[PDB]
Amino acid sequence: LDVDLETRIPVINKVDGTLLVGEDAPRRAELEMWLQGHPEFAVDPRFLAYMEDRRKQK
């Protein structure tokens, strides 16, 4: 119950709009440093909504 790091985080360029998915999008493990280099990109907000969706109780 984590993200488990090997997952692919969909990222979106907040300036441009380019959304990266699949292997175009970085590994969650590299994502931390990857975003540090380019704050232009951030995580996909719908992926965050997906985490909102992911719940453990009713």
CATH code (residue 36): 3.40.5.120
| Residues sharing a CB contact under 8 Å with residue 35, sequence separation 6 or more, in sequence order | 11, 41, 42, 43
Whether 40 maps to a domain, the answer reads: yes
Whether 1 maps to a domain, the answer reads: no
Whether 24 maps to a domain, the answer reads: yes
Experimental method: NMR
Whether 2 maps to a domain, the answer reads: no
| Number of domains the chain is built from | 1
Cα dist from 12 to 31, 35, 36, 55, whole Å:
12, 11, 14, 24
Check: CB of residue 40 under 8 Å from CB of residue 16. yes
3-state secondary structure of 35: helix
- Domain carrying residue 35: 7-55
Whether 28 maps to a domain, the answer reads: yes
Whether 31 maps to a domain, the answer reads: yes
Is 9 buried (19+), middle (13-18) or exposed (0-12) by CB count in 10 A?
buried
